[PDB]
RNA sequence: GGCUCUGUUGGUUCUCCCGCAACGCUACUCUGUUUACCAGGUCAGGUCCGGAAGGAAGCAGCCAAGGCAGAUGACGCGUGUGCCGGGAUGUAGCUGGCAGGGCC
């Protein structure tokens, strides 16, 4: 809504396929803002979803795209490598 | 100014197979101690046979070994990691691009 206020078009992307009902939550937040939200399912690859979200945003000429991520502790290296994979794909 | 679904293509999930790299799981054995005579070995002391030479049954101690524990390698069972790994397969499910219609 903050980015919806000055007239910038906003689209949301769900990057958490791990936690339960995160997709549905961001879909609720997306419905409250009356803006399209791109997500697939729980368990899906996050980097792929975010990638497709950016591609779609480029095709739909979306001004601002916000990409969510899964909650992760810093002491976990594999999740850090996953996030690095997300960035690398982006 | 947005959206949906077809044509084509890129991913992803599930089922099956496999490679590399990156994180995590039992039963046995090594040490800690334990088990009087009635599994075994060495068997002190003592005792049995003998003039002598020497053998003998065998307690304790010790070592296996049998109970109970502290953890060591391979078998057995798993995976929200990376190479968007390589493949098989869906009449599948989800997502994106493009050629676009049409709906507003
Ligand atoms: F949405 Al969360 F940990 F609760 F990423």
CSV table of C-alpha atoms (C1' of nucleotides) and ligand atoms in Angstrom, one decimal:
chain,number,residue,atom,x,y,z
A,1,UNK,CA,0.0,0.0,0.0
A,2,UNK,CA,2.9,2.3,0.8
A,3,UNK,CA,4.1,1.9,-2.8
A,4,UNK,CA,0.5,1.9,-4.1
A,5,UNK,CA,-0.1,5.4,-2.7
A,6,UNK,CA,2.1,7.5,-5.0
A,7,UNK,CA,0.9,5.6,-8.0
A,8,UNK,CA,3.6,2.9,-8.4
A,9,UNK,CA,2.2,-0.4,-9.6
A,10,UNK,CA,2.9,-3.2,-7.1
A,11,UNK,CA,3.1,-7.0,-7.5
A,12,UNK,CA,3.9,-9.5,-4.7
A,13,UNK,CA,5.9,-12.7,-4.8
A,14,UNK,CA,5.9,-15.5,-2.2
A,15,UNK,CA,9.3,-16.9,-1.6
A,16,UNK,CA,8.5,-19.0,1.5
A,17,UNK,CA,7.5,-22.5,0.4
A,18,UNK,CA,8.6,-24.0,3.7
A,19,UNK,CA,6.4,-22.5,6.5
A,20,UNK,CA,2.7,-23.4,6.5
A,21,UNK,CA,0.1,-21.0,5.1
A,22,UNK,CA,2.8,-18.4,4.2
A,23,UNK,CA,1.5,-18.3,0.6
A,24,UNK,CA,-2.0,-17.9,1.8
A,25,UNK,CA,-1.0,-15.2,4.2
A,26,UNK,CA,0.8,-13.1,1.4
A,27,UNK,CA,-2.3,-13.8,-0.7
A,28,UNK,CA,-4.4,-12.2,2.0
A,29,UNK,CA,-2.0,-9.2,2.2
A,30,UNK,CA,-2.2,-9.1,-1.6
A,31,UNK,CA,-6.0,-9.2,-1.5
A,32,UNK,CA,-6.1,-6.4,1.0
A,33,UNK,CA,-4.0,-4.3,-1.4
A,34,UNK,CA,-6.0,-5.4,-4.5
A,35,UNK,CA,-2.7,-6.4,-6.2
A,36,UNK,CA,-1.7,-9.6,-8.1
A,37,UNK,CA,0.4,-12.2,-6.2
A,38,UNK,CA,2.5,-14.8,-7.8
A,39,UNK,CA,3.0,-18.1,-5.9
A,40,UNK,CA,2.8,-21.8,-6.6
A,41,UNK,CA,2.7,-24.3,-3.7
A,42,UNK,CA,4.2,-25.3,-0.4
A,43,UNK,CA,7.5,-27.1,-1.0
A,44,UNK,CA,8.3,-25.5,-4.4
A,45,UNK,CA,11.7,-24.0,-5.3
A,46,UNK,CA,11.8,-20.4,-4.1
A,47,UNK,CA,14.4,-19.1,-6.6
A,48,UNK,CA,12.2,-20.3,-9.5
A,49,UNK,CA,9.1,-18.6,-8.2
A,50,UNK,CA,10.9,-15.3,-7.6
A,51,UNK,CA,12.6,-15.6,-11.1
A,52,UNK,CA,9.2,-16.1,-12.8
A,53,UNK,CA,7.9,-13.2,-10.7
A,54,UNK,CA,10.6,-10.9,-12.0
A,55,UNK,CA,10.1,-12.1,-15.6
A,56,UNK,CA,6.3,-11.5,-15.3
A,57,UNK,CA,7.0,-8.1,-13.7
A,58,UNK,CA,9.1,-7.2,-16.7
A,59,UNK,CA,6.3,-8.5,-19.1
A,60,UNK,CA,3.5,-6.9,-17.1
A,61,UNK,CA,5.6,-3.7,-16.7
A,62,UNK,CA,5.2,-3.8,-12.9
A,63,UNK,CA,6.9,-0.8,-11.2
A,64,UNK,CA,7.7,-2.5,-7.9
A,65,UNK,CA,8.2,-6.2,-7.1
A,66,UNK,CA,8.6,-7.3,-3.5
A,67,UNK,CA,10.1,-10.8,-3.1
A,68,UNK,CA,9.4,-12.6,0.2
A,69,UNK,CA,11.8,-15.2,1.7
A,70,UNK,CA,11.6,-18.0,4.2
A,71,UNK,CA,12.5,-17.5,7.8
A,72,UNK,CA,16.1,-18.6,8.3
A,73,UNK,CA,18.6,-18.5,11.1
A,74,UNK,CA,22.1,-17.2,10.3
A,75,UNK,CA,23.9,-20.1,11.8
A,76,UNK,CA,22.5,-22.4,9.1
A,77,UNK,CA,24.8,-22.5,6.1
A,78,UNK,CA,22.6,-24.4,3.7
A,79,UNK,CA,19.8,-21.9,3.9
A,80,UNK,CA,22.4,-19.2,3.3
A,81,UNK,CA,23.5,-21.1,0.2
A,82,UNK,CA,19.9,-21.3,-0.8
A,83,UNK,CA,19.5,-17.5,-0.5
A,84,UNK,CA,22.7,-17.1,-2.5
A,85,UNK,CA,21.2,-19.3,-5.1
A,86,UNK,CA,18.1,-17.1,-5.2
A,87,UNK,CA,20.3,-14.0,-5.7
A,88,UNK,CA,22.4,-15.8,-8.3
A,89,UNK,CA,19.2,-16.8,-10.2
A,90,UNK,CA,17.9,-13.2,-9.9
B,1,G,C1',-4.8,0.3,-18.2
B,2,G,C1',-5.0,-4.8,-16.5
B,3,C,C1',-6.4,-9.9,-16.8
B,4,U,C1',-7.6,-15.0,-18.4
B,5,C,C1',-7.0,-19.2,-21.6
B,6,U,C1',-4.9,-21.8,-26.3
B,7,G,C1',-0.1,-22.4,-29.8
B,8,U,C1',5.4,-22.8,-28.6
B,9,U,C1',9.1,-22.7,-24.9
B,10,G,C1',11.7,-22.2,-19.9
B,11,G,C1',11.2,-23.8,-14.7
B,12,U,C1',9.1,-26.3,-10.6
B,13,U,C1',6.5,-30.2,-7.6
B,14,C,C1',5.2,-35.4,-7.2
B,15,U,C1',6.6,-40.9,-8.9
B,16,C,C1',11.3,-43.8,-10.8
B,17,C,C1',17.0,-43.9,-11.7
B,18,C,C1',21.9,-41.8,-11.2
B,19,G,C1',26.7,-38.3,-10.4
B,20,C,C1',29.6,-34.6,-7.8
B,21,A,C1',30.0,-31.4,-3.6
B,22,A,C1',27.9,-29.5,1.2
B,23,C,C1',24.9,-31.1,6.7
B,24,G,C1',22.9,-35.4,10.2
B,25,C,C1',21.0,-41.3,12.6
B,26,U,C1',20.9,-48.1,15.1
B,27,A,C1',23.3,-53.2,16.2
B,28,C,C1',29.0,-54.7,17.2
B,29,U,C1',33.8,-53.6,19.2
B,30,C,C1',37.9,-50.3,22.5
B,31,U,C1',38.3,-48.5,27.6
B,32,G,C1',35.6,-48.1,32.9
B,33,U,C1',34.3,-51.4,36.2
B,34,U,C1',31.9,-56.1,37.7
B,35,U,C1',30.7,-62.4,38.2
B,36,A,C1',32.7,-67.5,45.3
B,37,C,C1',32.5,-73.5,44.0
B,38,C,C1',29.1,-75.9,39.9
B,39,A,C1',31.9,-72.5,31.6
B,40,G,C1',38.0,-72.1,30.4
B,41,G,C1',43.7,-71.0,30.5
B,42,U,C1',48.1,-69.8,33.8
B,43,C,C1',47.3,-72.1,38.1
B,44,A,C1',51.3,-69.3,43.7
B,45,G,C1',50.2,-71.5,48.6
B,46,G,C1',48.9,-76.1,50.3
B,47,U,C1',47.6,-81.1,49.1
B,48,C,C1',47.8,-86.4,46.3
B,49,C,C1',51.6,-90.5,44.1
B,50,G,C1',57.1,-91.6,44.4
B,51,G,C1',63.4,-93.2,48.2
B,52,A,C1',64.5,-90.2,44.2
B,53,A,C1',63.5,-88.2,39.2
B,54,G,C1',59.2,-85.6,38.4
B,55,G,C1',53.7,-85.6,37.3
B,56,A,C1',48.7,-84.7,39.3
B,57,A,C1',43.1,-82.6,41.0
B,58,G,C1',42.6,-77.6,41.8
B,59,C,C1',41.3,-72.8,45.4
B,60,A,C1',43.0,-67.5,45.3
B,61,G,C1',45.2,-63.7,42.2
B,62,C,C1',45.5,-62.5,36.8
B,63,C,C1',43.6,-63.0,31.6
B,64,A,C1',39.9,-64.1,28.4
B,65,A,C1',34.8,-64.9,29.0
B,66,G,C1',29.9,-63.9,30.9
B,67,G,C1',26.6,-58.9,33.3
B,68,C,C1',26.3,-53.1,33.3
B,69,A,C1',28.2,-48.6,31.2
B,70,G,C1',31.7,-44.4,28.8
B,71,A,C1',32.2,-44.1,22.5
B,72,U,C1',35.0,-46.5,17.5
B,73,G,C1',34.7,-47.9,12.0
B,74,A,C1',31.8,-50.2,8.4
B,75,C,C1',26.7,-52.2,7.3
B,76,G,C1',20.8,-50.3,8.0
B,77,C,C1',17.2,-46.3,7.6
B,78,G,C1',16.7,-40.4,6.0
B,79,U,C1',17.1,-35.2,3.4
B,80,G,C1',13.3,-26.8,3.2
B,81,U,C1',21.7,-27.4,0.5
B,82,G,C1',24.5,-26.3,-4.2
B,83,C,C1',26.0,-27.8,-9.7
B,84,C,C1',18.1,-24.0,-11.8
B,85,G,C1',23.2,-31.7,-12.1
B,86,G,C1',22.1,-35.6,-15.7
B,87,G,C1',17.9,-38.6,-17.2
B,88,A,C1',13.1,-41.6,-17.5
B,89,U,C1',7.9,-40.7,-17.2
B,90,G,C1',2.3,-38.0,-16.5
B,91,U,C1',-3.5,-38.8,-20.3
B,92,A,C1',-0.8,-35.0,-14.6
B,93,G,C1',-0.6,-30.5,-11.2
B,94,C,C1',1.6,-25.4,-10.6
B,95,U,C1',4.4,-21.1,-12.7
B,96,G,C1',6.8,-17.7,-16.4
B,97,G,C1',8.1,-15.9,-21.4
B,98,C,C1',6.6,-15.2,-26.4
B,99,A,C1',2.1,-15.1,-30.9
B,100,G,C1',-2.2,-13.3,-29.3
B,101,G,C1',-7.5,-13.0,-28.9
B,102,G,C1',-11.4,-11.6,-25.9
B,103,C,C1',-13.3,-9.7,-21.3
B,104,C,C1',-13.7,-4.9,-19.2
C,1,LIG,F1,7.0,-16.0,7.5
C,1,LIG,AL1,8.3,-16.7,8.6
C,1,LIG,F2,9.6,-17.4,9.6
C,1,LIG,F3,7.1,-16.9,9.9
C,1,LIG,F4,9.5,-16.5,7.3
